[PDB]
Design a protein around this ligand. Structure first.
Ligand SMILES: CS(=O)(=O)CC[C@@H](N)C(=O)Nc1cccc(OC(F)(F)F)c1
Ligand SMILES: [Cl-]
Ligand SMILES: [Mg+2]
Ligand SMILES: [Zn+2]
Length: 299
């Protein structure tokens, strides 16, 4: 049977909150079968646990935030992308503050942390959600859709005026496995637009934001092409974000996601629309590994 996975070891890291600019202490811990990913705010008394589930997503701009009452965890998308990428079913994520550390602005540092802690197979069937019927949402001319597909395919197109994009759209698609996630998408940084970052900095926001965690762009271009890791890196980052957002399903997905100018808000609308549409998906488990669609990093 394809087994559920947790971490083999407790593993700690330190980084800066993207908005706070202050140190955050991150602890990844093993968790029992059927826990899913649980964020835990250990700076609070009592401790506040928020399951990484679609229903717990708060309404925020340009990042995925989890909310329980007045308590929040900001910027969960990159860590959840790494958890999805290496097939981590079950873990506690402890934080000293309301933000996941931004690290280098990709999932790379998180992949290194999870890899290094090691993958522990657990004595329970891994549950997958198989898309059974097409589900789409539209907002203006933005679109996000799931369709049935035997695998995990994530496709994305973006279209912007800014001269950095050279008058054209950026398109990319990943046929997802642990290997293709790590290689094609995991280190992709987003564009930090100088005009936007300066505006946020005047409000004592994005204090942790810099060339260390974004590709900085001026009125016309990437200032340092040196800092680029991929072609069409911006859309490859959109795929990274999506994989992290789609993991708020609480299980590995079997089907195809196509995003047209989508983002965290519309991804979350699609997710919640799919969950509410009970005949459009089913939970499956696999007794013979060799007939499962998705390749994951061997433990
Ligand atoms: C733009 S998006 O829709 O792709 C969403 C991107 C979002 N997931 C993200 O990674 N933002 C991000 C990362 C590092 C720095 C930063 O702030 C800075 F540096 F830009 F201010 C912002
Ligand atoms: Cl479409
Ligand atoms: Mg239906
Ligand atoms: Zn991102």
């Amino acid at each position: 049977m394809i087994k559920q996975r947790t971490l083999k070891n407790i593993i700690r890291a330190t980084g800066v909150g993207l908005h706070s600019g202050e140190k955050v202490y991150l602890t990844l811990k093993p968790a029992p079968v059927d826990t899913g990913i649980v964020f835990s705010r250990t700076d609070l008394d009592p401790v506040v646990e928020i399951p990484a589930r679609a229903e717990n997503v708060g309404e925020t701009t340009m990042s995925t935030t989890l909310v329980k009452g007045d308590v929040k965890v900001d910027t969960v998308e990159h860590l959840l992308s790494a958890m999805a990428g290496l097939g981590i079913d079950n873990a506690y994520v402890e934080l000293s503050a309301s933000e996941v550390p931004i690290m280098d602005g990709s999932a790379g540092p998180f992949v290194f942390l999870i890899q290094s802690a090691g993958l522990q197979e657990q004595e329970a069937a891994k549950k997958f959600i198989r898309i059974k019927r097409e589900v789409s949402v539209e907002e203006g001319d933005k679109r996000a859709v799931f369709v049935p597909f035997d695998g995990f395919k994530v496709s994305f197109e973006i279209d912007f005026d800014h001269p950095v994009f050279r008058g054209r759209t950026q398109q990319a698609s990943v046929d997802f496995s642990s290997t293709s996630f790590v290689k094609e998408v995991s280190r992709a940084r987003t564009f930090g637009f100088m005009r936007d970052i300066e505006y946020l900095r005047s409000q004592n926001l994005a204090l942790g934001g810099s060339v260390e965690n974004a590709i900085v762009v001026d009125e016309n271009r990437v200032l340092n092409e040196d800092g680029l890791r991929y072609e069409d890196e911006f859309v490859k980052h959109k795929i990274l974000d999506a994989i992290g957002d789609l993991y708020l399903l609480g299980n590995s997905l079997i089907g195809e996601f196509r995003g047209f100018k989508s983002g965290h808000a519309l991804n979350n609308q699609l997710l919640r629309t799919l969950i509410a549409d009970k005949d459009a998906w089913e939970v499956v488990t696999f007794e013979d590994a060799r007939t499962a669609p998705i390749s994951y990093m061997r433990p």
